[PDB]
Amino acid sequence: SDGGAQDCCLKYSQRKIPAKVVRSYRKQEPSLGCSIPAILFLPRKRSQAELCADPKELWVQQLMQHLDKT
């Protein structure tokens, strides 16, 4: 949105983005923002911004474990 991202989760996973091509994720504060946390995908590529994904998906949940590992 013009000004930033006010609404929780800017985009949803229309494509499947593996933890191989992303380095880390970004957590969405679920207390002040929205009751459900969000997983932001920060890819190795920087052509796009942080893409939010639905973390209830198994693959996103799996990525969390790889991506948290630095």
Instruction: Report all structural domains of the chain as residue ranges with CATH numbers, in order of start.
Output: 1-70 (2.40.50.40)
Distance of CA 29 to the CA centre of its chain: 12
Q: What tokens appear for 20 in the block?
A: 């191989």
Q: d(Cα 57, Cα 63) in Å, to the nearest integer?
A: 10
Conformational region of residue 26, where left means phi above 0, alpha means psi within -120 to 50, and beta covers everything else: beta
If 0-12 CB within 10 Å is exposed, 13-18 middle and 19+ buried, where does residue 52 land? buried
Round to whole Å and give the CA distance between 14 and 29: 23
- Sheet strands (E) in 1-70: 22-27, 39-43, 51-53
7 φ, ψ to 5°?
-75, 140
The experimental technique used to determine this model is NMR
Query: Which residues are CB-contacts of 45 (< 8 A; sequence separation ≥ 6)?
Result: 21
